[PDB]
Each structure stands twice: as structure tokens, then as C-alpha cells.
Amino acid sequence: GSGEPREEAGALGPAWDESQLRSYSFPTRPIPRLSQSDPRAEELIENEEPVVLTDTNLVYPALKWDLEYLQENIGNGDFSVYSASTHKFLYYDEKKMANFQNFKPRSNREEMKFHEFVEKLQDIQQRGGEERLYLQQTLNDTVGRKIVMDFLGFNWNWINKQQGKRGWGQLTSNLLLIGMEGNVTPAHYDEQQNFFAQIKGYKRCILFPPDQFECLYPYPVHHPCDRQSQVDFDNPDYERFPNFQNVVGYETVVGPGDVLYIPMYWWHHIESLLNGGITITVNFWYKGAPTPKRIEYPLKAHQKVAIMRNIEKMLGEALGNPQEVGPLLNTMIKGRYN
Amino acid sequence: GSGEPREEAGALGPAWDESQLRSYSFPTRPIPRLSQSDPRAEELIENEEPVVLTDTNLVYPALKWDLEYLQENIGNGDFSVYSASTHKFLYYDEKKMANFQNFKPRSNREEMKFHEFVEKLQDIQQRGGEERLYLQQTLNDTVGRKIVMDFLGFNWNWINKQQGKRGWGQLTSNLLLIGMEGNVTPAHYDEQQNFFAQIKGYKRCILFPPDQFECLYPYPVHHPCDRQSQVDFDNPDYERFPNFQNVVGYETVVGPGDVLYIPMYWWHHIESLLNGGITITVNFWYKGAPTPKRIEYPLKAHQKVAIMRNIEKMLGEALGNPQEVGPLLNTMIKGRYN
């Protein structure tokens, strides 16, 4: 899996041990941990394969962040805070809830000030409760000046050269992630390039390449859980998702100062280590490089994923109702392509 | 089925008896036999439902045609003549044979002069052979003057008013069909409006509306047998085509002077009656009325058929190879829409 856990400097003991990792049915192989000076890492990023960069200093001024420093300087803005009854957080598109009334949310969002989220957090911890919170908020301009200069201290020289050397679109947003220990963002894929910059705590990252689409069974494109796996990693229904017995992931554990390149359309399962405290992450999202003019075959796996996405979308608009997409596709293939 | 067989004028006995009809597994109901003066027939054509018109006089000058008269006056042109080992004639798109090398033809076309087709026909009949021929040739300008004035004697006044009253495109071709008794054109659908004008002999016509697509399992759009049913009507494989046990057809027997409106996208199975002699038919093909601007829901069954056709076609061009259309569609629906 994540291999032997790393030893921290000053003989401060192992960063983590295997008992902080949850258990799953599939095998994993390690994502390489390299230096940004190492051309191997430059090659993996160009080939859109994940790599963990150990020395970008991307969010070096942010490494001092904790709950106290942030609450004092983050400002008086509103922060999206997602609550969950269990460790699996259930995210959904609230716009697409119009198409699936038979879908009930179990992880609702709540806007609140940063001091309210910290108050609500220690309230759960002193009460011994089991409710979980996950703060996910795009950084805007309403943030204090001390956090502003921390932001200015990011290694923009390195990441901008990466944005230009790959031909990516410009940075779209910076997402701040403050999660509780044991929190799980279940497997899903994103449509942009991601630099996963870990700040506080450790996160286990399990990635699946786009060519394992048929092993991970994403929800219908019109479903509020579009881009998420239907497979319950904790209780995989092998009768509904038989190819999940063939899935094989890429695994790593990122700590403070580590930066994980999650390529676009790559599945990822992110969990904050059990009994590891709160985790802090900042994501850098870039739109992928524009699709080239000369179409070259064979197609990349992610290009076929985009094709299936658009067939579903266009079929939903053509039939006038997304709920008829399913039966028409079965009509199209039953006894004709299977 | 076709109901009680009609009695011919002058007490010349029944036109046909049930023993000339082949046997099939599905039930049928009769296509109405009306007069073109009857507004009910005008309503069926407008609703794109089949009707048999008994008194159009559409091909009145052609009713005198037989093998001898045609051979003398049809001219010295080349006629497409399809040969078959069995009663089921196997038609295919020769352009699409590039995609399915694993497909071998069993009914080859042969160009020949009209006198050669008649010579080859009586050759089979005197030899007692079982090889079958089917002449199918679009009428052109290379045809003799006596046939030209027969053509001019067609009821263009009636059929042109029908072409205008429905908003159809112009006439695209006239197909002459001369078949042997027992010949079968297996079930398929056409993309144009058809006026089926019977001249000599009797043909049993079995039609299925477009909403029975999932009962009739057409070949993949890129297959040389695109638009034909994969179901062998003589030996239906219920394990591969289970919804064929739900199919229900519309049946009629057309004779000399009868005109059958086969609406666009309607399946049809056409067989020349057993022991009925040669059959002669002329088809009038019109492109359907252009799709209206304001898209109105619910969609017609044939509109959904066009949607599935175009998804298959566009997917074949996007992937660069029609043979990958199947696996991608299964990947798209397996565990996601079924």
C-alpha cells in the first residue's frame, strides 16, 4: 500500500502506523514520492500520472496554520461546513436534485463563520458525540491581511511554471479543506487538474486511473452524485458492481509540505487518518489543456469518459427528461450490442 | 390475420387461401382496406398509420404487365437481380462490408439484361431447381417508349396531391420488383415514405409500428444489415431476442390494383404468396416531411429511433472504429442504467 511509514526528523517517531488506515478489498501500489528537481516527477506530471512532490514549498507559509491562528486572521466571512452522521461524507449537486426527488441527502451543508465552526467542533468533542464536520470553502478576498501575506508567500514561481509547461488553463479556485480525523471523501473523479497541497495532519489518498471506469460504476450524469462511485467501499455489492473485484488503486499518505498531483479525470478516495487529529489541505485547480486540433488515436481513457458524459447529457436534453436516458440506452443495446 | 380472403369478380373463386401464407409465432391484426375517397384513409395516412387503398388507379396502365410485355418494351438496360439459396433473401450494404469482414453474403446481386433474367428464370423452373431470383431495379430513362407512356398513365394527380397534403419531400425513386412465388424480404424498416403499388400476383405484408423496436432487434447501424431485424422469423431465438415473444404485427394481402401505404420507419415483412406465381410491384419513395422547428413532447417512436441511430453513428466516428461502439455502450450502462 503506502509502504513503510516515514520517520520524522529529530527521532520524533513514525508519522503514522497502519492501524490509522481503513481496510478495503482491493490492492494498491504506491504513488512515487519524488522531488520537484527530479525529472521523473516532471515526466509523471506531463504524462498525467500522479506523483507526490516532497519539496515544492508550495504552501510553506501555511504550514503554521492551525485552528487558533486561522480563526484570528481568516476574517468574518461565511464558510461552507458539511455535516455527516457517518465517516462517509455524501456530497451532491443541489441543482440536479430536481431530477431525482427519490434521493434524500444525508450530509447537509451549513454556512457559518469560522469561529462558529470551531465552537461547533469542540462542542462535539467535549460531548463525546460522533457527528462529523468538514469545512470546505473557496478562499476569496474577504480574508484577513495576515492570511493574505501567507497566500502571497506561496511558491507561485514553481506552480506557475507548471501551469505554463503543461499548457493548462488558469487557476480557477483555491479550496481550503479542514476535516476531522477519520473523515472520508468517497471515490470520485474531477474534471480539472489538481495540486493537492497538504498543510496539517495526514491524509491517505487512493487514486484509480480513468481506464478503471467500468470497475467504479459512477452515478448517472444527471444524478446529484454525478462523478461519484456508486460502490460502497466499506461494503462493496459485488452482485451490482462485479468489476469492483478487479479494481486496483494507487496509494499514498501525504503530510505537511507534501503536494500530490491528482491528474484530471483520475478517481480519488481521500480519508483523514484515524486518530490523527484535524487535517488541513489547500487545493489548486487548473482547467486542463485544451483538446488538440488533430484528433490522434487511440483515444486516452479520459477522452472516452468525456464521450460517455456527453452522450448522456445530450440524450437528456433530446428526450426532454433525464429519467428516460436509462431505458433508451437499454433499448439501444439489449440484444444489439451485448 | 389477413382476414377472410377476397372473392374475385365474375365468380372466379378466392384470390388466395391460407395455405399460401407462411406460419409465424406472433399474432397480427388486419390493415384496413379502404377507398381513397374514404376520409378514414386520409386520416390514417396523415397519422402515419398503414392503410390499403383499393381504388387509386395509381398504376392502372401497369396492370397489364407480365414477363412477355415487359421484356419486349422495358429496353436494353441493366437490371439488378438478387439470387438466394433459400426463401429468405439476405440484403446488405456493400459499403458497410468494410467494417465486418466476419460477415459473408448468401444473396449476391448480379447485373443483367431483362431477357437474361427471364431466360435464367425459366431455366430454374424447367430444371426443377430451388434457386430463387428477385429483380429489383430503379426505373430510369433507358426504358422503352411503350413503358414510358404506361408510366405517364399513372395517377400522378392523386399521388402528387398526397405528396403535397403531407408536406413530403419529392419523389426519390421508383423501384420495380419482380419476384418469384414464396420469396421473402425479411423484416426491416425504411427511412422514407412508401406507396406500395401492387401490379401482378399477391404479396402478404406484415408491418410492425416503430414502437416495437425493442421487440425486433435491428443489426448495429454500422453492420451491413443495418435496419434489418436480427430475428429469424422462421426460427426465433427467444434466448437472444426475448421481446420477440411480445411482437404483434399488422397484416394484409395486396393484389393487382391495391396500394399499401407503408409509413416511414415502420417495419415490414413482405412475402410473395406460396404457389401464386410471379409478383410485380412498383414502389413510390418520398422523403418524409422535414422535422418541425418547435420540438413537441412526447417524442414519436420514430424520432427516438432516429436518436439511437445517430448516437451509434456519431460514436463510430468519434472512436475511429465502429467495432468499439458496442463495448463503450456496455461500459456506459453496465451497473449504471440497468
Ligand SMILES: O=C(O)Cc1cs/c(=N\C(=O)CCNS(=O)(=O)c2ccccc2)n1O
Ligand atoms: O477530502 C479531500 O481532501 C478530497 C476532496 C475535497 S473536495 C474534492 N473535490 C471537489 O470539490 C470537486 C472539484 N471538481 S472540479 O471539476 O475539478 C472544480 C469545480 C469548480 C472549481 C474548481 C474545480 N476532493 O477530491
Ligand SMILES: O=C(O)Cc1cs/c(=N\C(=O)CCNS(=O)(=O)c2ccccc2)n1O
Ligand atoms: O419485397 C418487397 O416487396 C418489399 C421490399 C423490396 S425493397 C424494400 N426496401 C428497400 O429497398 C429500401 C428502401 N429504403 S429508403 O431509405 O426508404 C430509400 C433509399 C433510396 C431510395 C429510395 C428509398 N422493401 O421493403
Ligand SMILES: [Zn+2]
Ligand atoms: Zn475531487
Ligand SMILES: [Zn+2]
Ligand atoms: Zn423496405
